[PDB]
Ligand SMILES: Nc1ncnc2c1ncn2[C@@H]1O[C@H](COP(=O)(O)OP(=O)(O)O)[C@@H](O)[C@H]1O
């Protein structure tokens with residue numbers, strides 16, 4: 001939502017201020033949730049906001065290129081659809097490593113339930129492993 | 132000491148009655164209708180008649196303004212009650228009026244005023260008091276100078292009165308009952324309660340407050356549409372609590388020439404600080420402290436800086452309270468809303484129908500109404516008006532009534548007569564004309580109020596009623612269990628189904644049952660904030676919604692985004708998703724504690740962007756089925772209850788035959804049946820005059836066949852062209868969108884324990 005907010009009007013000020021805030025508070029783990037939102041938005045009938053999409057992607061690319069490697073500021077991005085994203089990002093000096101996150105199965109699921117149902121009551125009757 | 136009690140505002144209008152709670156009534160061994168002696172500051176004694184009331188507490192005595200001005204006390208003071216059953220009958224009196232309430236009367240004050248007041252009243256009186264009697268058009272107050280036996284006596288049918296004598300002057304202790312009080316404000320009960328809560332202690336008890344050593348409020352903002360009566364509220368508080376109300380105009384200070392304007396403001400603050408606990412009222416704050424962009428000149432910046440410095444110069448020891456009045460809180464310069472300066476904000480909204488009723492009731496206390504007055508109807512008809520407009524309405528209705536009959540009454544040369552200004556009875560023909568010529572001032576504003584739809588208005592939909600009652604009522608009624616069980620309450624509900632199934636009625640009904648403010652937003656408004664600016668238009672709406680909690684915000688036709696974006700235009704998509712992005716942004720940011728409930732409505736759910744349908748956001752979906760032959764009988768009863776019903780009723784083929792009708796076509800069927808009835812009635816009337824124009828006196832009496840009646844024939848002339856509002860194919864697609872979830876719900880078999 002914030003990415004699209006700085007996609008329908010201005011594009012430059014917000015990226016500069018957010019990267020400055022991230023750099024000044026080092027160390028930090030900057031997070032870019034739903035990096036595919038712009039690609040999903042402009043992939044439909046809408047075909048006018050592409051200029052601002054170039055603006056946003058260019059800002060992200062430029063103030064990743066301008067970050068000194070001595071400063072400890074990571075960048076993490078999560079995308080639901082990887083293929084339609086810009087392949088310029090997946091270049092050395094930018095987001096390079098790709099980690100695949102599978103769907104939890106069986107033995108992971110019982111741990112998921114154990115973590116979730118800590119809550120305050122209990123379930124001493126039904127067996128977690130069965131479900 | 133079982134005598135000391137604290138005074139409080141009463142409800143009864145009679146001057147010589149007070150309200151006591153039953154335990155104090157029993158403990159003091161006093162009976163109903165007797166006389167008791169009351170005493171307070173400055174050694175003032177009064178006589179009154181005890182009346183019962185369970186609402187007041189033991190320490191709380193309810194008593195109205197005239198007795199208070201007799202006792203020379205204020206709210207929250209301490210008075211003591213003593214038994215007085217020895218009061219005897221009376222004798223010669225010399226009741227006299229005051230000069231500044233009798234100018235231009237010149238009438239028989241004995242017959243017009245005192246006789247109605249003392250007739251079957253048995254009101255006791257005491258020497259040296261002031262009592263106010265309501266009459267023809269003004270307020271008249273009389274004073275007693277002596278009586279026999281002195282001072283106590285009760286007016287009896289067999290006593291001698293004299294209203295002859297020159298008017299006396301003011302007692303010189305003010306005590307003017309013609310000023311404002313708490314009874315002159317209506318429709319703003321909650322806001323007045325808040326103001327009393329946050330102002331009464333620093334002004335009434337300064338010594339104890341400075342003893343405790345806690346920071347008092349230094350500024351209060353009142354913002355709302357003009358004419359709602361903010362200055363009235365400030366004046367009422369200042370007069371009743373006891374203060375030195377000092378008013379500072381905006382334009383008057385602004386237009387004072389050269390750089391001398393600051394000197395007046397500084398002198399005002401320095402003079403207010405040196406007198407007493409005061410209430411400085413800065414009127415039209417936005418006139419002298421506007422936004423930074425608007426301050427083209429340089430004197431405005433100097434004035435604003437002077438105001439800020441003077442406001443900051445309120446070091447600890449200061450009983451001065453600054454109150455400011457303004458329009459919407461966007462014109463004020465942001466630097467004024469820091470801490471130490473104006474921080475508290477109170478919203479004085481436009482009154483609703485009930486509030487209009489109390490305003491009209493207040494403004495016509497003097498006027499002599501007729502027996503044809505229907506003030507509740509006028510209040511129900513006058514939506515979109517503020518206090519000043521209703522005051523002007525009453526005033527010019529009185530002028531119309533006096534104008535209609537003025538030659539016959541005595542126009543004299545300089546004064547009036549009391550008798551002639553008593554048959555003046557304003558009637559509904561005057562008020563209808565008054566409404567016919569009047570321009571409302573508010574109109575195009577968002578209105579928040581309790582909807583009047585009751586659960587019985589809607590028919591059927593028991594499952595949806597149960598789900599809504601579970602979802603909205605439960606979190607606010609038993610909060611502890613939610614916290615103790617891990618469960619974290621839900622935020623909103625999205626409705627979907629065929630159009631015309633009554634989603635808006637259900638939302639209004641649930642808002643009424645939950646007893647919370649309702650705010651409705653229409654599709655056209657969303658389209659308006661589409662084309663152009665969408666930033667603030669989704670900002671002040673949420674600000675108002677959050678400020679007036681508890682609330683049930685309703686979004687109608689949320690699907691218009693895809694309805695208009697979808698097509699051959701495609702260029703409105705940017706400003707389009709601006710709106711949805713703003714909705715998501717300030718709907719994911721609301722605190723879970725806030726009890727602001729969001730409800731969405733749509734009829735083409737497949738095209739809604741699935742970003743909204745996520746956990747934390749609007750998640751629960753309730754399907755509203757198209758009513759069919761189960762419940763249309765209830766719908767028809769609901770929408771034909773108001774009309775003068777019919778004979779033989781439907782209950783039958785009328786409802787039975789139709790299968791697949793929404794509410795809209797049933798309502799239009801009712802409208803068409805009533806239209807046919809009206810057409811028949813008017814045609815019979817026109818025939819009656821077209822027949823009697825050539826006839827002599829035919830003992831013309833009330834026989835005109837005017838009794839309303841809508842027989843089966845009218846309904847027959849109605850269902851001959853009714854149409855199926857909802858097409859059959861729509862059901863398929865809506866139920867397929869439901870089937871997506873239901874097939875995702877397919878796995879439901881009971882597993883092993
Ligand atoms: N109970 C009431 N609520 C609101 N307004 C009222 C009430 N009683 C009287 N009024 C009218 O409201 C007017 C207030 O005038 P004004 O000071 O201009 O209001 P504001 O300054 O808030 O615009 C008075 O002239 C009075 O006639």
Ligand SMILES: Nc1ncnc2c1ncn2[C@@H]1O[C@H](COP(=O)(O)OP(=O)(O)O)[C@@H](O)[C@H]1O
Nearest residue numbers: 588589590630631632633634635766794795798
């Ligand atoms: N008990 C009822 N059930 C269903 N509809 C009703 C009922 N009573 C009245 N109606 C009609 O339903 C309409 C409500 O429209 P609304 O539900 O807002 O339309 P939409 O569902 O398209 O938003 C009213 O105009 C009214 O004429």
